[PDB]
Amino acid sequence: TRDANGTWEMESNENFEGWMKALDIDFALRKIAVRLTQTLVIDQDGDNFKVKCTSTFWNYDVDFTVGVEFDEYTKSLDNRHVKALVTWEGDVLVCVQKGEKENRGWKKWIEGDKLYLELTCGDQVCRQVFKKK
Ligand SMILES: *C/C=C(C)/C=C/C=C(C)/C=C/C1=C(C)CCCC1(C)C
Numbered sequence: 259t260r261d262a263n264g265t266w267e268m269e270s271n272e273n274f275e276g277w278m279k280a281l282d283i284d285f286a287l288r289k290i291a292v293r294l295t296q297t298l299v300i301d302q303d304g305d306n307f308k309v310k311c312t313s314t315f316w317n318y319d320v321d322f323t324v325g326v327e328f329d330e331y332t333k334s335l336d337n338r339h340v341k342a343l344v345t346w347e348g349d350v351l352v353c354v355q356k357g358e359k360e361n362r363g364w365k366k367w368i369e370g371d372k373l374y375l376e377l378t379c380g381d382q383v384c385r386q387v388f389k390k391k
Pocket residue numbers: 278291294296298309311312313316317318364366375
């Protein structure tokens with residue numbers, strides 16, 4: 259319920275292109291990223307997280323300690339500097355990324371076998387569902 263450890267296989271991905279567009283990802287690369295199968299690998303140890311979301315051409319990596327603000331440079335995404343902070347709101351893992359973009363961050367709900375991930379930027383929300391492999 260608070261345990262996010264695992265290798266996570268995607269089963270659905272809603273409004274992916276609206277969220278990428280809100281981040282200003284190149285329209286060309288958007289309709290490549292649309293094609294790619296993603297595997298989310300989470301290593302969680304106490305407060306310390308290592309998140310690795312992987313695909314053929316394109317990976318997103320982040321490591322953080324819950325409750326410790328960190329500078330994040332989204333080099334493989336929109337290549338912006340944000341002030342990221344990840345915390346627990348109940349059993350909901352919440353990341354707020356302060357910077358140019360408003361309403362920017364993500365949330366993870368872990369429901370036994372299922373991981374629900376909502377990514378937000380501006381007025382767009384991308385809803386993803388992964389299953390533990
Ligand atoms: C808790 C899980 C998180 C924060 C996972 C985030 C994953 C991404 C931001 C993935 C982004 C990607 C693209 C938009 C294009 C294709 C490659 C991806 C899947 C790494």
